[PDB]
Amino acid sequence: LVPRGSHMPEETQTQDQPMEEEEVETFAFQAEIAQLMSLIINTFYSNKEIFLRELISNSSDALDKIRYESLTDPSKLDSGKELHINLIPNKQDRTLTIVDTGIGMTKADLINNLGTIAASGTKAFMEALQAGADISMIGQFGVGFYSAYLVAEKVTVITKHNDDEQYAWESSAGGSFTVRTDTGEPMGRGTKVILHLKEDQTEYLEERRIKEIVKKHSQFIGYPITLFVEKER
Numbered sequence: 001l002v003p004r005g006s007h008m009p010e011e012t013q014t015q016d017q018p019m020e021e022e023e024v025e026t027f028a029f030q031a032e033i034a035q036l037m038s039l040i041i042n043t044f045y046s047n048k049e050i051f052l053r054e055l056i057s058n059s060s061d062a063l064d065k066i067r068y069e070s071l072t073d074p075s076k077l078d079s080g081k082e083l084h085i086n087l088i089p090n091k092q093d094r095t096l097t098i099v100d101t102g103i104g105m106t107k108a109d110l111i112n113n114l115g116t117i118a119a120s121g122t123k124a125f126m127e128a129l130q131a132g133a134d135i136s137m138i139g140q141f142g143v144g145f146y147s148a149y150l151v152a153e154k155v156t157v158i159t160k161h162n163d164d165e166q167y168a169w170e171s172s173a174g175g176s177f178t179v180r181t182d183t184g185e186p187m188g189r190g191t192k193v194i195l196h197l198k199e200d201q202t203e204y205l206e207e208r209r210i211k212e213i214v215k216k217h218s219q220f221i222g223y224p225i226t227l228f229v230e231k232e233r
């Protein structure tokens, strides 16, 4: 009835998909974890680079679990995904992302493993730090994840486990964290730790520095690790 030979982009733009709801919950850190985070954030240490060793060791542990979970559920053998770690610096956004294809975490694993439960060593570790211990000993005390806050002002964890949906955990410290269903880019099984780096900690975006600290502290991962470098324009 109204003849057309050619339409403008705005006229043929497709209608949006329906808006999704994401459920968000807010939790307090367990008291001694909150105290540890404030000690880590606000104290000078000379050897902050050990954060990456701690995150890589968490990913290697999650990857080891795929191998062993196949003994009680062989269907994991029929994933085609490679077991590996990727390190992804973004200079534009000032972020360093550690990506693995390990087992991932469920919603309740994020709440119970990343802030609301007390590790038995936390008070002894804070006393060892008062007495002048090197921050490197953190791993031995059961609280290595929080070493992220040596270099990051905010941390976001995106994760997907075979038994749950995809979730995002986030904290800028200050005593609480959030967990919220994540209906964005599906990441497939595994975990992605996004460090939003402090302004004076941008060395950890540079390829030589990252290679230096992987060779110094993370030579027995047991899985391939690759470093993605954005081409300089």
Ligand SMILES: Nc1ncnc2c1ncn2[C@@H]1O[C@H](COP(=O)(O)CP(=O)(O)O)[C@@H](O)[C@H]1O
Residues within 6 Å of the ligand: 054, 058, 059, 062, 100, 102, 103, 104, 105, 113, 114, 142, 143, 144, 145, 146, 191
């Ligand atoms: N990349 C990852 N994949 C799966 N789970 C992870 C993870 N990073 C941290 N976690 C979970 O977070 C817990 C706490 O990590 P920490 O390094 O603080 C203590 P540890 O369990 O390694 O001795 C881990 O036990 C694990 O359940």
Ligand SMILES: [Mg+2]
Residues within 6 Å of the ligand: 054, 057, 058, 144, 145
């Ligand atoms: Mg650990």
Ligand SMILES: [Mg+2]
Residues within 6 Å of the ligand: 060, 220, 221, 222
């Ligand atoms: Mg190992």
